[PDB]
Amino acid sequence: MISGLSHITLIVKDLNKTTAFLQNIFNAEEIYSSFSLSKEKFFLIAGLWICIMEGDSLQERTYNHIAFQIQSEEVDEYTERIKALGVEMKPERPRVQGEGRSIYFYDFDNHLFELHAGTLEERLKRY
Amino acid sequence: MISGLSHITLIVKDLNKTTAFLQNIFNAEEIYSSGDKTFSLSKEKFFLIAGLWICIMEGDSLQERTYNHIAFQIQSEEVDEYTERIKALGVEMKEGRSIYFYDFDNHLFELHAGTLEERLKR
């Protein structure tokens, strides 16, 4: 069986610019930096290992994405933080009852990120 | 501050085919299903894989393959086992430490043997 999540790998055209992005918004803690076969850095974000690699590859924008957990009270604060950095944010997404609030925004390489204030239990409860 | 991972959302063309893929390889447990084509409401399912909430929504597959991907952890002793199990599904694969393969929607997945924590020793 699967032990769990190992890490998430994102390819970006500008590693230093993305690094700043992650450190500002996610309080990402760099724990590794690339003789290396590629320019990459590993960050620890809320217990999750995120690997960023510099490269030309660019995935078209889609709803395939990662969602991090935040508390309801923090929605406005993160909204202000994203707004401050001029990063593109999505408008309010339609929701069903039991589905908590979320914020959606992009990095500089078509990666959509979600900050979700809801829970799985609430979602399944009504269900 | 961000307390951790909430969930991972993937878009796939065939939800029933993907569900089989998830259950077979990752021992994914379906815990939720919604959708009503007569109500113009697309299909969506929730699965639990090693305690992780995975949301799957039916839609378009990724247009091209890129190195952006998710990596799940397994045991080193399990590398050969998972290699063969993946092969049995006909999906394309790119006893070491990492297995790379795609599902039917151009999503690159990685099965990593060992912990990145231990990986740090370059």
Side-chain angles (χ1 to χ4, degrees), chain A residues 1-34 36-37 39-127, chain B residues 1-94 96-116 120:
Chain A
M1 296 183 272
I2 302 303
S3 306
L5 185 60
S6 176
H7 60 276
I8 300 173
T9 301
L10 303 180
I11 305 292
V12 303
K13 52 194 173 181
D14 191 327
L15 189 60
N16 301 321
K17 189 176 179 186
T18 297
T19 288
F21 174 77
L22 294 178
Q23 297 173 316
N24 281 333
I25 300 179
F26 301 101
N27 293 194
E29 171 183 57
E30 179 168 335
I31 302 181
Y32 174 80
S33 185
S34 61
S36 182
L37 302 173
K39 186 59 181 180
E40 64 185 7
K41 289 187 173 187
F42 302 171
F43 303 80
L44 195 64
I45 297 180
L48 309 177
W49 285 64
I50 311 297
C51 174
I52 308 296
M53 289 174 63
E54 195 161 65
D56 166 64
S57 302
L58 175 58
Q59 189 74 257
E60 73 277 16
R61 290 189 169 185
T62 67
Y63 202 49
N64 286 279
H65 73 281
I66 295 159
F68 295 91
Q69 180 90 59
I70 55 169
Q71 318 307 299
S72 174
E73 321 75 65
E74 309 182 87
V75 177
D76 289 353
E77 299 219 316
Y78 273 100
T79 300
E80 286 285 357
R81 282 218 247 175
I82 303 298
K83 174 180 175 292
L85 301 177
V87 26
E88 179 182 357
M89 271 187 51
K90 290 296 202 193
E92 193 195 329
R93 189 188 174 72
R95 294 175 296 152
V96 291
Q97 305 292 47
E99 182 179 4
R101 298 171 65 195
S102 295
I103 303 169
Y104 302 84
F105 59 96
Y106 295 92
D107 65 347
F108 318 107
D109 298 275
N110 290 343
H111 297 116
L112 178 71
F113 290 96
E114 184 193 331
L115 296 190
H116 186 221
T119 63
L120 169 58
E121 200 196 318
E122 184 58 58
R123 188 52 193 283
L124 305 174
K125 197 221 298 177
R126 188 198 69 182
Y127 146 63
Chain B
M1 175 182 70
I2 302 175
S3 66
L5 177 72
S6 173
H7 57 276
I8 296 176
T9 295
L10 298 173
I11 305 299
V12 296
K13 202 66 176 190
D14 200 314
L15 198 44
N16 295 332
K17 283 198 58 180
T18 291
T19 289
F21 171 75
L22 292 177
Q23 297 167 322
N24 282 344
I25 299 297
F26 309 84
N27 286 289
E29 184 198 331
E30 172 172 344
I31 56 170
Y32 179 88
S33 183
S34 61
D36 183 15
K37 71 174 189 175
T38 71
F39 226 51
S40 283
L41 287 174
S42 60
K43 289 172 59 64
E44 164 174 50
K45 279 187 179 194
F46 295 172
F47 298 83
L48 288 181
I49 295 185
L52 309 169
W53 180 12
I54 303 302
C55 297
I56 309 288
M57 294 166 83
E58 214 165 57
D60 295 5
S61 308
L62 292 176
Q63 286 153 45
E64 299 282 1
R65 293 178 171 176
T66 66
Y67 200 60
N68 290 283
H69 67 86
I70 303 166
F72 294 91
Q73 177 169 52
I74 58 171
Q75 312 294 169
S76 172
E77 310 70 61
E78 293 165 337
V79 178
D80 297 311
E81 178 196 330
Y82 278 101
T83 300
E84 285 299 322
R85 288 176 65 173
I86 293 172
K87 192 175 182 179
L89 302 192
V91 300
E92 298 177 54
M93 290 178 89
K94 291 181 58 182
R97 278 185 166 180
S98 284
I99 300 172
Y100 298 78
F101 63 103
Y102 304 86
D103 63 1
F104 318 88
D105 295 272
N106 288 324
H107 294 121
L108 176 67
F109 290 92
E110 177 193 336
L111 288 184
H112 181 60
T115 67
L116 282 174
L120 295 180

